[PDB]
Design an enzyme around this catalytic site. Sequence first.
Site, PDB file in Angstrom:
ATOM      1  N   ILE A  74       0.812  -1.210   0.000  1.00  0.00           N
ATOM      2  CA  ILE A  74       0.000   0.000   0.000  1.00  0.00           C
ATOM      3  C   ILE A  74       0.849   1.265   0.000  1.00  0.00           C
ATOM      4  CG2 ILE A  74      -1.765   1.290   1.253  1.00  0.00           C
ATOM      5  CD1 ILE A  74      -2.545  -1.476  -0.068  1.00  0.00           C
ATOM      6  N   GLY A  75       1.865   1.280   0.855  1.00  0.00           N
ATOM      7  CA  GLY A  75       2.735   2.435   0.968  1.00  0.00           C
ATOM      8  C   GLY A  75       3.393   2.921  -0.308  1.00  0.00           C
ATOM      9  N   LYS A  87      -7.797  -0.981  15.937  1.00  0.00           N
ATOM     10  CA  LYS A  87      -7.621   0.241  15.159  1.00  0.00           C
ATOM     11  C   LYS A  87      -8.490   1.354  15.747  1.00  0.00           C
ATOM     12  CE  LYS A  87      -6.196  -1.668  10.720  1.00  0.00           C
ATOM     13  NZ  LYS A  87      -6.257  -1.442   9.248  1.00  0.00           N
TER      14      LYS A  87
END
EC number: 1.3.1.45
Length: 307
Positions: free
Chosen positions: A14-15, A133
């Site tokens: 993703i990064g 989260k």
Amino acid sequence: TENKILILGPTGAIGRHIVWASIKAGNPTYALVRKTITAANPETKEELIDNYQSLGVILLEGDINDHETLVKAIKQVDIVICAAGRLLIEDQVKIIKAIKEAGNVKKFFPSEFGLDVDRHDAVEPVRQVFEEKASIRRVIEAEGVPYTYLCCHAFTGYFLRNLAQLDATDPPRDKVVILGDGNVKGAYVTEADVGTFTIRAANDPNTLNKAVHIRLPKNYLTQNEVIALWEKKIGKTLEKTYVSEEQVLKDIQESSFPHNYLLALYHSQQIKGDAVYEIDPAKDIEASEAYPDVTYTTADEYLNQFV
């Protein structure tokens, strides 16, 4: 484009797209990387880092577990993005501590990049991950760290690629199993596009202390709609089996890890409809409404590569 953006977990699946989108937008882009030898895939790390440097990305040396390096890196930027991946969710406590000490952060993006964790009805074992989260969100809010929660829902490379089928990497061409009746909307987006929207949000003052939701019109599809789209592409009808929620829940309880985790994830996305909800203008931003100019890759286009 004056905002200096630091990406943690820059070489992750993703990064990397966040790093590239930051460069594309023209933002001074920084990536936190350890100049030490680890077990990370060497070809991927090397290729990505070389590419980043060739694009002008500034590498800041540090490790999420080395407070001094963290604070030093953060003091050099304006926005901090914790890209989902190898980094542990709970380690963001260390990141927040460093952010507070630095004191210059204008916006922090925690490791979200999924459903809105304050809006779910999931079952274990995935429920606990979502709650972990959510706990981080509470810490961020309590600490007064300016934030943006990027809720991109279902990544195409993770959900759509195998039409949410177990033990399959590519789209099935003969038979498919549907959880529930298949008429529950899901939201899909490519990893590249998540990078683009994340940076759009980073540069948008309106996302201050807001959750940004990615539910793109042409990619807002029920599983039945996804299957019909794929069938049109390969020119054949798939055999279909629909399984009741009760049967799915029993399957989750009796499955070993991580199969139970996977099914619970699909249950929340396919049956409970975690991408289905109306937003609150005081706390949410709808990406498709705020950034209509972004030309996203459609689910239809995404699947063309597998035809």
